[PDB]
């Protein structure tokens, strides 16, 4: 799957140097592509596996969304697990709630990805995505 930003259309979640951001015209476009597996800490949740780096998952660390090799720890699995919810800015779209930090959501901010509290209208828009099956 791919994930487009809804307020920066044509921008996609991608990994650059093992760090999550949103970019247009992702090159190599495979950096924008993930396998969606059951949540490592909860199968009613989701986890994001790298397509180019199998066994690496998107995960938050110091509230920054990064890519990191799987580790056999509860903290890693929790850091790597997100609940898909109706979009903050648009219920026809999606948002990603952190499993171990329930009041923090994946959002972009100067085109980097974090998990942060969603308080304002711009917060909601920065945290809203369109899943695209590829
Ligand atoms: Na903070």
In CATH, what number is assigned to the domain containing residue 57?
Answer: 2.80.10.50
Give the Å distance between the CA of 134 and the centre of ligand 1. Answer: 33
Given in angstroms, what resolution was this structure solved at?
A: 2.1
State which residues form the domain around 74: 2-132
106 contacts: CB under 8 Å, gap ≥ 6: 65, 82, 95, 96, 98, 113, 114, 115, 127, 129
Rg of the chain's alpha carbons, rounded to an integer?
13
Distance 12 CA to ligand 1 centre (A): 23
Q: How far is the CA of 62 from the centre of ligand 1 (A)?
A: 9
CA distance to 23, 29, 71, 101, 107, per residue, from 110 (Å): 11, 21, 29, 22, 10
Number of domains in the chain: 1
Technique that determined the structure? X-ray
């Amino acid at each position: 799957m791919k994930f487009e930003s809804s307020n920066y259309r044509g921008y996609y979640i991608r990994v650059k140097s093992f760090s999550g951001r949103i970019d247009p015209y992702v090159n190599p476009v495979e950096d924008s592509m993930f396998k969606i597996v059951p949540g490592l800490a909860d199968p009613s949740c989701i986890s994001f596996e790298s397509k180019t780096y199998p066994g690496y998952y998107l995960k938050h660390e110091n509230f920054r969304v990064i890519l990191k090799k799987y580790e056999d720890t509860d903290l890693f699995r929790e850091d790597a697990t997100f609940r898909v919810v109706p979009g903050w800015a648009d219920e026809n779209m999606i948002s990603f709630q952190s499993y171990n930090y329930p009041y923090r959501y994946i959002r972009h901010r100067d085109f980097e990805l974090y998990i942060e509290n969603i308080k304002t209208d711009l917060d909601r828009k920065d945290a809203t995505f369109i899943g695209i099956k590829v």
